Design a protein around this ligand. Structure first.
Ligand SMILES: CC(=O)N[C@H](CCCCNC(=O)CSCCNC(=O)CCNC(=O)[C@H](O)C(C)(C)COP(=O)(O)OP(=O)(O)OC[C@H]1O[C@@H](n2cnc3c(N)ncnc32)[C@H](O)[C@@H]1OP(=O)(O)O)C(N)=O
Ligand SMILES: [Zn+2]
Ligand SMILES: [Zn+2]
Ligand SMILES: [Zn+2]
Ligand SMILES: [Zn+2]
Length: 533
């Protein structure tokens, strides 16, 4: 097997000895923490015969020092990988409450502290040994790319290189300043996903708000509707035969589902921090579902900058959605407030281990405070829970309460099969909401076109793809990377591909004169703004 790269970077052994030794030096000054590591583990003095069955590749400061002093490391990544193996042997063998498990953890604290800057000034990205979180002995490792002009291996996630965007391979930042070239634009941005009237409304609401209270670190927000499609919820068999042969209510119930996502710019790159999936039941839907919206589910990653404003803008998103559907025809929404189960993630693949998922009362009062802001906001004219809304809007049978896809009531009515029910309504009353947009006739019209995009049809597609491809949202850097790859997924697996149209003639034109500041204004030659060809 024969390989090449004609002007690689190799480090003279005294070079990387001089660069790396201060970091080992640090590890060594940690007394006593470093003491069980200055020499190899001797199971004869410790009385642990099983050790070399558990730890197959021992490593210790003295071995790394000997390797360093005799130039056995040709690239700093081998140095780094050796000391991480030492730490990983420490963590693997000893219980997480061990004394030397703790020692190990502190040594790792300070080796992280020291290795990032030196590795950086040796051209590389960090000095970390990274691994993806497990699924279902093995772990999958983080990916690397090798710079094309210098050969310095770097964490793909760290430097955010994706071949599909820059198909000529990867070249580092320094190898570019060395050639005076600037970086090539990521066209596959959140901003440049298809913009749409709904998403524009939400993003305008929160952008004005975060200007209103402006922390200097907050960045631009982009809301975007990434899929939209006409589905119908089929009525479950028992529940169906007691009311459809009757003819009281319909076989199916037609709605439009929309998946919509929010991105913030953080360190100059989009970081997708919020997602939502709604079912909207139009004016032509047979009752009970007529003119109702329902948020099928919500999800969030807490890396919004600044975490102070986090919740305020989650709320401004939700209430902007209520405002928008209000304005064009719907009259009641519905927020079943159910906490994320198990280790089940709603919309985003792998959540940050330090992001606490609420218990239902936290959840219920969060929804309640968002709703209160909406009431005060002139926007929603009232709201109350499902029980006090089912007996105030007096109701005697089951085909009278909305019947949504994947909702709880459909399934519990279904299993009330062997017949009580009217009373379970207010056991779970504070988790199910009812939301009145109007106080109080012309039909709904959705300006926004359909967006066929299977990855965002429902929620299983995107989670599955992300679990495969390891797009986790567990780190700000992993989130950055997963946002990147998800955006080029949305951009290049456009199940819609466009039949452009000009705007003064409503024609269908191959060559057109786009406008720069209009959101989509083209003109077939055959006007105010600066048009470009
Ligand atoms: C059968 C089946 O599967 N069926 C289902 C059917 C679908 C159900 C449909 N229903 C829904 O869609 C219901 S709404 C969506 C529920 N899902 C989630 O919420 C996902 C995870 N959570 C979040 O994204 C967020 O919490 C969010 C609610 C979006 C906003 O959070 P936040 O940032 O505004 O504040 P915080 O998180 O409440 O907490 C804010 C403070 O609370 C703290 N905190 C939170 N939780 C806890 C806790 N448990 N213990 C202690 N402290 C705790 C936290 O430290 C923090 O502190 P600080 O502000 O000082 O830093 C299926 N289809 O899978
Ligand atoms: Zn790195
Ligand atoms: Zn380079
Ligand atoms: Zn024309
Ligand atoms: Zn224009």
């Amino acid at each position: 097997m024969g390989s090449s790269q004609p002007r690689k970077k190799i480090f003279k052994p005294e070079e990387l000895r001089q660069a790396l030794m201060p970091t080992l030096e640090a590890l060594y000054r940690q007394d006593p923490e470093s003491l069980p590591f200055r020499q190899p583990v001797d199971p004869q003095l410790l009385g642990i015969p099983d050790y070399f069955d558990i730890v197959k590749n021992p490593m210790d400061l003295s071995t790394i020092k000997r390797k360093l002093d005799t130039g056995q490391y040709q690239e700093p990544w081998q140095y780094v990988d050796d000391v991480w193996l030492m730490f990983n042997n420490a963590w693997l063998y000893n219980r997480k409450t061990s004394r030397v498990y703790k020692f190990c953890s502190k040594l790792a604290e300070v080796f992280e502290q020291e290795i990032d800057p030196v590795m950086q000034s040796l051209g590389y990205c960090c000095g970390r040994k990274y691994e993806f979180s497990p699924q279902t002995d093995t772990l999958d490792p983080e990916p690397f790319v090798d710079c094309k002009e210098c050969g310095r291996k770097m964490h793909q996630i760290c430097v955010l290189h994706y071949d599909i965007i820059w198909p000529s391979g990867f070249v580092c930042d320094n190898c570019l300043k060395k050639t005076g070239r600037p970086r090539k634009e990521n066209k596959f941005s959140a901003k440049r996903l298809q913009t749409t009237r709904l998403g524009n409304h939400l993003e305008d609401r929160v952008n004005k708000f975060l200007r209103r209270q402006n922390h200097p670190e907050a960045g631009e927000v982009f809301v975007r509707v990434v899929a939209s499609s006409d589905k119908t919820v089929e009525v479950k068999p028992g529940m169906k035969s007691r009311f459809v042969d009757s003819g009281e209510m319909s076989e199916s119930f037609p709605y439009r589902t929309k998946a919509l996502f929010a991105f913030e710019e953080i360190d100059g790159v989009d970081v997708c921090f919020f997602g939502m999936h709604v079912q909207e039941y139009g004016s032509d839907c047979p009752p009970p579902n007529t003119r109702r919206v329902y948020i099928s589910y919500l999800d969030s990653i807490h890396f919004f900058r600044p975490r102070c404003l986090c919740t305020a803008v989650y709320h401004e998103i939700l209430i902007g959605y209520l405002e928008y559907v209000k304005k064009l025809g719907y009259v009641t929404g519905h927020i079943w407030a159910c906490p994320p189960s198990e280790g089940d993630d709603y919309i985003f693949h792998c959540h940050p281990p330090d992001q606490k998922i609420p218990k239902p009362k936290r959840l219920q009062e969060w929804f309640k405070k968002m709703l209160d802001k909406a009431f005060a906001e002139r926007i929603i004219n009232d709201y109350k829970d499902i029980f006090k809304q089912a007996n105030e809007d007096r109701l005697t049978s089951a085909k009278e309460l909305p019947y949504f896809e994947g909702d709880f009531w459909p399934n519990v009515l279904e299993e009330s099969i062997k017949e009580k029910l009217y009373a379970t309504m207010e056991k779970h009353k504070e988790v199910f909401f009812v939301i009145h947009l109007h106080a109080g006739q012309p039909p709904i019209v959705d300006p926004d076109p359909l967006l066929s995009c299977d990855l965002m049809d429902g929620r299983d597609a995107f989670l599955t793809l992300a679990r495969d491809k390891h797009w986790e949202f567990s780190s700000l850097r992993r989130s950055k990377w997963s946002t990147l790859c998800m955006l080029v997924e949305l951009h290049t697996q456009g199940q819609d591909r466009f039949v452009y149209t000009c705007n003064e003639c409503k024609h269908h034109v191959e060559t057109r004169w786009h406008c720069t500041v209009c959101e989509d204004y083209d003109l077939c030659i055959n006007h105010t703004h600066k048009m470009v060809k």
